[PDB]
Design a protein around this ligand. Sequence first.
Ligand SMILES: *[C@@H]1O[C@H](CO)[C@@H](O[C@@H]2O[C@H](CO)[C@@H](O)[C@H](O)[C@H]2NC(C)=O)[C@H](O)[C@H]1NC(C)=O
Ligand SMILES: *[C@@H]1O[C@H](CO)[C@@H](O[C@@H]2O[C@H](CO)[C@@H](O)[C@H](O)[C@H]2NC(C)=O)[C@H](O)[C@H]1NC(C)=O
Lengths: 132, 132, 462, 53, 52
Amino acid sequence: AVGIGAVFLGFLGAAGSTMGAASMTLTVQARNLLSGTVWGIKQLQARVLAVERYLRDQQLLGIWGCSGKLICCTNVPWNSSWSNRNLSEIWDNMTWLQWDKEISNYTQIIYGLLEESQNQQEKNEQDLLALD
Amino acid sequence: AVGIGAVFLGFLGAAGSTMGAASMTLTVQARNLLSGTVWGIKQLQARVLAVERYLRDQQLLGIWGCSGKLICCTNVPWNSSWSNRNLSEIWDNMTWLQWDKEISNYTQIIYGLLEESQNQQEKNEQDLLALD
Amino acid sequence: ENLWVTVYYGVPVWKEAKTTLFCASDARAYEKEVHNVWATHACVPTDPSPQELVLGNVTENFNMWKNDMVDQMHEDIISLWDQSLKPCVKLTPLCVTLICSDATVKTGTVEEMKNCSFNTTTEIRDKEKKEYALFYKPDIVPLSETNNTSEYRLINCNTSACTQACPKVTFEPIPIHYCAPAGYAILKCNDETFNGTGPCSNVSTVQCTHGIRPVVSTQLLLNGSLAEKEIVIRSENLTNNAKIIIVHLHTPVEIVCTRPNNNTRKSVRIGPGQTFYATGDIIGDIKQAHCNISEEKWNDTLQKVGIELQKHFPNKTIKYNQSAGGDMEITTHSFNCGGEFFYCNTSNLFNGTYNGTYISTNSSANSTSTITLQCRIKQIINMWQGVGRCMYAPPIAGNITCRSNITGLLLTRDGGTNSNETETFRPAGGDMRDNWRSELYKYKVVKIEPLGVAPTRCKRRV
Amino acid sequence: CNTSACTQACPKVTFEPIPIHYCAPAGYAILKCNDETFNGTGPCSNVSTVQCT
Amino acid sequence: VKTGTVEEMKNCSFNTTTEIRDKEKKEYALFYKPDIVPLSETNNTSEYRLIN
Ligand SMILES: *[C@@H]1O[C@H](CO)[C@@H](O[C@@H]2O[C@H](CO)[C@@H](O)[C@H](O)[C@H]2NC(C)=O)[C@H](O)[C@H]1NC(C)=O
Ligand SMILES: *[C@@H]1O[C@H](CO)[C@@H](O[C@@H]2O[C@H](CO)[C@@H](O)[C@H](O)[C@H]2NC(C)=O)[C@H](O)[C@H]1NC(C)=O
């Protein structure tokens, strides 16, 4: 269960569990992204490591209008055409791997819409604050 | 004194002073973390530089629930067993070096508690916002 | 009712993909000041922690043959071997016309060596003196078509040059832990009854792999891993007979080999500050190197493997036959011990049959019974192709013992004909990829996609 | 020929000693003991910070 | 050449070391004139050297 207290679930101890239980303890997965020491050119080549992919993720998350490496609720409507499935069957008895397998075909459009939604909201807020 | 105006205190000009005076002008210490140019394999090996430790610090600070490279007040209670010392003797006439020397033995527990406190608060706020 | 998007960072997702791995080794190698293997020079200190965490409920597909980790390991080993020989003396002024005669030691005579004398340049750039050395016959080739039996040449200068390995560096196999870089994870199939291709119902996650012995062998596998429960057979496909069948063992089989000749080394200095070692006189009675295996244990293992193989071929009995033959390096069991390369013959070992009638060996009438094999020795070695294959192994004084264990075998189907009731199997070696693939079947490498999306009954506060 | 081989230095390269400033990388600092009566081992009551030596 | 003669090439013969480190045999080859230079001031027309 998740009520261990002092978390020592390892790198991927929560994988394969329910979404609700696996929703917590997400910090350990993100934190463990650094290791290694020098040997030769190839080691330093690989030592770019997550420094590039982590920056990619940070750019994508910040552009969408989210601060902090945690959950972030947006305002984009969920078009039912993508899934058209019951809420209970997804959020209670389904793991992340098969969900990603099912929803792997609709990634570009949602990211594109989220990219401009944050900019629109920021400009509207700037205009509202500048009006006074 | 700290009332110089245009700050030119160097990299570590404020070290050894009181906590109150040294509390300000913390930006210069963090900003100066980049230098160097290429010569050989070892130079590029060292050119990882603060890019790894800075990312470590950013991960640790963001996980705790703090945005911006400045002060950040948390809600964890201060158990007196660690120090059990007067407030005046620490915040007025003590420097950071000896304070760190004294309090170097209680670093893991506080970080561990701060890691989960932010997640708990975030989940509670998410539930509160989702209830409506 | 209405649901809205939400983004999650750190969601565990696995995607199989290619990447590079690091090597780590125990700190005992770092204790040596210099000239201690290559792990201390090329790998990091390791740590058993963390333990192999087991996941609650997971499902995955494992493939053994369609993997690139073995190729990466082979490339790394090849690069390390090529780099290690750069500073050592490369010889070259030694392929002059050698005048060779029959070896006649004070204690008798030996047929496997020849007493070759030749001129060598002294410390002076232009000045020559005569020198002598004993050389093994396989490293000696007639010079030209002119049948002058007094002239000979090394088996070289027709393919490529040669280089002598340093004496202070040893070839002992030190275990290497292959660890993955950050951003990737290593998944381990915990099932001990895994056939080699298919899913595993118990998959764990590991930081770094266990010890891996970089050993070299063709027919059999030397000391290494052991099976957990019982013998398991792994093969790419039984439809094609050309594929190599790897057979594991539930218990090891002891093997001990030796060379009591008690050779001694000479010291010939050629060029500025570099010497070439060679075998000189021999003190003591002349004897033959040999290898020793236990008979009852080998027969029991063979019967166990036979009954395990009967499931795939229930309509046919089992028989074993001598290897194909040909070149010495192909059909002979070639291995290394203490810097000396041994080539053994397995003709006396793979000779038997089994028709499903189990025979108990619990009588133990003579526990001292054993099977003996005769072996040859070579100095010039062509380990691989197009890597600067030629290498010279210097001799070692005294006589050595090479006690070790056997835990695996390599077999190959024979071409069936006439619907024979007794289709056989033959030993057959090949590249080191087959040897290294038997110890990396459990591990797979995956990449993490921490970003994900999901709907929920929440909205952003304005 | 009794110890090792030899090599001739190029003629166009000189052995004149040019001063070299040893500087520290970012994330590290160089502390300098300003006391001129320092014995070699012990504390200094006047310590400065320097970019490069 | 068997078919005639050519002015842009010369038939140079020289000793070369065989697979044996110390053993020489004669060999021949045709070389273009620009890659051929007289050896020394001594006007011996039978001796030549590469332009190297
Ligand atoms: C192999 O032959 C060489 C000669 O080609 C032997 O070396 C000579 O041995 C005789 C008798 O011991 C000495 O008088 C000579 O001075 C030796 N010659 C040199 C150059 O040292 C050599 O002993 C033979 N090998 C063995 C094992 O006897
Ligand atoms: C050289 O050969 C001899 C005879 O084969 C070896 O003799 C014994 O080797 C065992 C190996 O464990 C030792 O325990 C014994 O003490 C040796 N002596 C006797 C009388 O049995 C000898 O070991 C070989 N040399 C080396 C270095 O192993």
